[PDB]
Amino acid sequence: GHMNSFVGLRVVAKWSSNGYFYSGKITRDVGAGKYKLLFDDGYECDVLGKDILLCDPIPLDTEVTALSEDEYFSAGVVKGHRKESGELYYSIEKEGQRKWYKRMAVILSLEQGNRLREQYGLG
């Protein structure tokens, strides 16, 4: 395949207002270890390298938060994967049944994302 150093890569990043980890594209290395992230929700914010996870397609059995487009929030566990229209999806099992959600909707609660930071963290 092909890649570029940070800028352009889809990654998961912490929303710096002490929030969870959400999907985004690194728009630019800001400097000093900050990289700006065009979140897939269209927000654009600097995030420090330690707060970005760049090789993070969610592993199955990981616990995650899930957001419906009609803005309902829950948490559950990844139990599968899909690809549709060039976008990456996860079947989040909740209440013993699978529900499909998309990368930007499968948000890693901060204590979940921490377990990935030690491996996938840029910093």
Added chain:
Amino acid sequence: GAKRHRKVLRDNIQ
């Protein structure tokens, strides 16, 4: 019951 609890999503961004 429950509803979006943190900042996520937006509209007209395309």
